[PDB]
Design a binder for this molecule. Sequence first.
Ligand SMILES: *[C@@H]1O[C@H](CO)[C@@H](O[C@@H]2O[C@H](CO)[C@@H](O)[C@H](O)[C@H]2NC(C)=O)[C@H](O)[C@H]1NC(C)=O
Ligand SMILES: *[C@@H]1O[C@H](CO)[C@@H](O)[C@H](O)[C@H]1NC(C)=O
Ligand SMILES: *[C@@H]1O[C@H](CO)[C@@H](O)[C@H](O)[C@H]1NC(C)=O
Ligand SMILES: *[C@@H]1O[C@H](CO)[C@@H](O)[C@H](O)[C@H]1NC(C)=O
Ligand SMILES: *[C@@H]1O[C@H](CO)[C@@H](O)[C@H](O)[C@H]1NC(C)=O
Ligand SMILES: N[C@@H](CCC(=O)O)C(=O)O
Ligand SMILES: N[C@@H](CCC(=O)O)C(=O)O
Lengths: 295, 366, 132, 402, 89
Amino acid sequence: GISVMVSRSNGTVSPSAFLEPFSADVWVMMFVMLLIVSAVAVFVFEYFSPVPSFTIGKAIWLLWGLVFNNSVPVQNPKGTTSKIMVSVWAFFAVIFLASYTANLAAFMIQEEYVDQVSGLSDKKFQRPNDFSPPFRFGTVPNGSTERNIRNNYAEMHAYMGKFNQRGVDDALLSLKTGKLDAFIYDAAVLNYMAGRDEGCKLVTIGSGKVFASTGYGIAIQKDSGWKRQVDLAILQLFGDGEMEELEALWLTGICHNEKNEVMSSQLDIDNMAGVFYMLGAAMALSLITFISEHL
Amino acid sequence: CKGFCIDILKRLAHTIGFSYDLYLVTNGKHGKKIDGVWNGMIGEVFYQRADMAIGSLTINEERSEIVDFSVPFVETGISVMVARSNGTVSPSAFLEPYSPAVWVMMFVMCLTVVAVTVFIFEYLFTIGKSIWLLWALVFNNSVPVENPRGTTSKIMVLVWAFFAVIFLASYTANLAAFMIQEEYVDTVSGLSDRKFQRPQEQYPPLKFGTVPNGSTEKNIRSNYPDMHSYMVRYNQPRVEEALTQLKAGKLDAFIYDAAVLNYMARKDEGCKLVTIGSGKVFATTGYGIALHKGSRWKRPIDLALLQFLGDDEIEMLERLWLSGICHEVMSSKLDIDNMAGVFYMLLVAMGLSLLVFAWEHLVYWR
Amino acid sequence: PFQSTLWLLVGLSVHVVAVMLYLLDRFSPALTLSSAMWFSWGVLLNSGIGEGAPRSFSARILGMVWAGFAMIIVASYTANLAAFLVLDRPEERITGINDPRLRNPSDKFIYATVKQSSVDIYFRRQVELSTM
Amino acid sequence: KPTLSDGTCKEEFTVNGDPVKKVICTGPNDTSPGSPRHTVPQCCYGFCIDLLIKLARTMNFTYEVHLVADGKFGTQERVNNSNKKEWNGMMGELLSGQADMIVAPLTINNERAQYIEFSKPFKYQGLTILVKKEIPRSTLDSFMQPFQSTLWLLVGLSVHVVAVMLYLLDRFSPTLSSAMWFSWGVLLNSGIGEGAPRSFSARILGMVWAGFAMIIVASYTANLAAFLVLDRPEERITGINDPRLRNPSDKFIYATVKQSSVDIYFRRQVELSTMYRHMEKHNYESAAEAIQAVRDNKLHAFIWDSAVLEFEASQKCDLVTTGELFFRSGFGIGMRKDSPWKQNVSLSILKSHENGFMEDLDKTWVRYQECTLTFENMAGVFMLVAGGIVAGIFLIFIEIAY
Amino acid sequence: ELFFRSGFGIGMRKDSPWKQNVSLSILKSHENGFMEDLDKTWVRYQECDSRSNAPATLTFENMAGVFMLVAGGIVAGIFLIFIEIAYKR
Ligand SMILES: *[C@@H]1O[C@H](CO)[C@@H](O[C@@H]2O[C@H](CO)[C@@H](O)[C@H](O)[C@H]2NC(C)=O)[C@H](O)[C@H]1NC(C)=O
Ligand SMILES: *[C@@H]1O[C@H](CO)[C@@H](O)[C@H](O)[C@H]1NC(C)=O
Ligand SMILES: *[C@@H]1O[C@H](CO)[C@@H](O)[C@H](O)[C@H]1NC(C)=O
Ligand SMILES: *[C@@H]1O[C@H](CO)[C@@H](O)[C@H](O)[C@H]1NC(C)=O
Ligand SMILES: *[C@@H]1O[C@H](CO)[C@@H](O)[C@H](O)[C@H]1NC(C)=O
Ligand SMILES: N[C@@H](CCC(=O)O)C(=O)O
Ligand SMILES: N[C@@H](CCC(=O)O)C(=O)O
């Protein structure tokens, strides 16, 4: 058919990767549990027991500083029954924090990467003159894979003129260098090249996706007499299983590009973008409360 | 009749040329001596009631003195098969995921810094109050500690605080990597273990047995007479009947030839039966075709069997017939035994504390 | 993550270590018995309650090793919980036509197709697969 | 090994304390490698020699050991004139009358089985491939793998900007030193400083800031606990039928030892003609030369006996074996067809298998040798401590002067 | 994995006048996107997802003992109050 090749080096990180553990319930409904224990301790456990002042404001600060690891200065209450309640809550923080780390490591062992393109109808191919420094793609001329594009997508055929390789061997070199980003060719060869490349640095878009399914064949002379006898011979090889052996002997590759397990990843600003914008809401959240605090 | 051995027989008759007529023997099995006579596939060849005895026959020394075998085509010995136990990990993994040099060098950095942060406090705090602080940051701030009062002494502990996070965060990462992928620890060794030779000297009486009237019993009787007398009470009349005993929990180990136990250990539902030694074989003697001691067919057969091994025709027959599924790690709870390594760390400290207590107490007297 | 027998031993080990901290410090040349108890729990549970601290040098070294046993037990807990979430995966499935369960079928396994179709013709002209 | 000046071999002892048994070997000094050489007595000892002394006592004969002249194992070569075929090496001296027995590792074949009679094998084995281990361990030299240099550029900027704001909201509501020490305390989790958010505005920003610190540490641990598991730079040959072997890529050089039995195995098959001709121009003369080539990266694979390659793997500890056995044929003592010792030799090998005698010869001569984070991968985390001490000292002199 | 690859096809009797133009309309339809459009509407509407490794998220029903522990201890201290004051009384 027709397939597209890419470099697989850049990939695409997954933003907002920290709120997947737990859900919108265990986060939100923990605050009310925080506010209940704090209110009960100050007004019942501490007030009605013997042994300067322990208001609600310092109590919520204390119980907030144990869930996020003991890091902030606090004040501890008095009385025997008050410390028992605080100690139990500290045993809830250990379980809550420990499971969060263990669960997060599970999601980053079995992560999945997405392609930068979806096919031959993506806007990067159809309209390349409206983006950042434009996408680079090209194909070897004088072939079937160029005649099909020239009839259906003549708008992008003109843009493909500048990028025009002169061989499959040469085009695979410029992909690793960076002179072009995509290579459009036939699917029976690009699959073999990707499966016989060291380091697994070349992959096919769509995990083996075709777009104009037309197989090979023998070009006999027109109105010949050998056509029927050849067809029955080819159809006989399929029945005996003599075609799979030939594929195993010649068309076998070693790279496991089918497996999507990315060999580790490095966190960057784009990857770690949600955490900073979580603080972004707090940049003006206190500033908004600054004006209302006067009244 | 069909099988792995029969496919060998058809090729030999095709590549050499002769006519045969198989017939099952009813007198015995595999051959045995009753002090004067032989019964089975060996006695018939010995008494000239047949010419060859193809099948699963083991090359021996007692048998090879009356009949002549051929080139072996399948390896075979003795092995022990036991039920798969719970996943066992090394208890010493509490301190293993590191190096002795890391902890040897761990305290040489602290000893220098504690002196520096105290000496620099003289210019504008005892040593005992310095070790109690800098060491405490390593295991997370959870113990009351004194703090300095200098605009530069606070800077040094910031550097130490940064190193504390890296050490703790990395330690819990290596431990997960070790407990995700690992290898199971074996339980028993082969026939030379102490549970077999003298089983009556341990509180749990190990239960094992084998099918009588074979070659894997004559081997045991003439080498380990002490073990043989104990196995008399534990005998089974069939291989499949003995396998249910392991499933039912009655027996603990089954001693049989390796070429059969390996097949039974692969063709299984759930694959909870394993062979001790990960494929350990004792007294290695392959199979063979018995002949008439003068059969004159020995040389053509041997050159025919050795020709198949030159090609890969025998290898194909192994893939077609002798192949199975689930030829690994287990999620096991920690339990006391696996975590018992770290409890010994505290035991030494309790004993060491008393000796230091006696040192201070006695020197104060004088 | 931990067996029920191991958790009860951790709780029992807190009192035993704490009880002789008071004995060790008092006899040697002052923290009350109840004040020592808050010290042991605070270290294990990471809570920030209490103020009592050991005074004797011999008493310090015991309450100092205990702060290392508290970190190991917590660290081992989160490493095992990362093994009950990523290691729950068995492996048993049919792999193509070359699977042993198909070449040599048993009575417990049953497979079939649709009568009078292309698959019937495929399984007749091949003589090696004459057993299924 | 060479003998002493006196003439007798050195007296050595085993680990248990049993002296080893040695004989006198009279072979060529260097097997004439382009230059003539005479024969000098030497010392021989090993698995097969220890087995030879057992047969002499049992069968009551006398022996004298001499090495092969050229040094090969045996194959059939054609004379230049006509097509007269004669054997060469250790296999061609048995038929010529210069030897009566061969106690050495000889694979039981079919070509040599038509001229001599072997015995029941005394060791079952197979063929396997040998490669060289690469990338001994992950480097991890810099601890900043999870967070690129861009992260630390602004994370350290984030603590300062949040610190100055903490001084602003509380002050102008119904200092710098107090605010700065509190901000760094949460990030690194150090119990220092007494500054607290007394005002309401400073509290709401401080509570959120505590959440940010926990997230950074949690992400750091998860990345390090996931990168270690997902570390697999696959380079294994996976035995035979690998695409890199059936179809050579002109950059993978693999060979074996001349003559021997691997050459016979590859020449008979016609589907292996495309790979036999590749290594026909790279075959070495001895196993010891091929092993050294692997270490020096002048060779990439080696096809030889499993019983030998699995002894060098546990000794060198720098190269490893990989693949699956694909030619099962044991060893065997070779004799002429008219020898009368054939039956007794074969009956004295089956008995030793079942007596446990051939387990002592395996423990003594084969199975005795078996070759985390550590200092490496964390040298960077050590220099910051020293750098902090050195940098801090200079500021102290200014502090004293201030 | 697939082990017998042979596609479909419109069957016609031998000596049929339509045997050429039927086989030329199919080739053109492949290259015009028509047969990659019938696949979209009739064969390729996803309805249920698959198992990409074992990703597990934690919900409230997963954490019952943890939250009932603090809720089960808030009443334990109330009983302690009635006996803590009893020490002075
Ligand atoms: C192989 O062993 C057999 C049996 O041990 C030997 O045959 C015996 O040889 C002794 C020698 O004098 C005779 O007295 C016996 O009568 C023989 N037969 C038996 C049954 O013992 C045979 O000689 C050995 N082979 C060689 C080459 O010596
Ligand atoms: C393609 O056709 C053009 C025009 O005929 C010719 O110049 C060129 O050499 C051909 N081949 C390639 C690879 O462009
Ligand atoms: C073994 O042989 C004895 C000989 O009498 C016989 O009684 C016994 O049943 C046999 N056991 C078997 C074949 O399992
Ligand atoms: C073994 O050899 C010795 C040496 O000549 C000789 O006495 C005889 O052949 C044998 N001795 C025995 C069988 O006692
Ligand atoms: C097929 O097309 C050709 C030209 O378009 C036409 O002449 C012919 O009649 C067509 N076939 C049939 C069966 O009508
Ligand atoms: N598979 C194509 C190669 C040429 C091309 O893709 O341009 C053909 O044979 O026509
Ligand atoms: N199958 C082997 C062993 C039988 C057994 O262990 O009883 C034989 O024929 O001798």
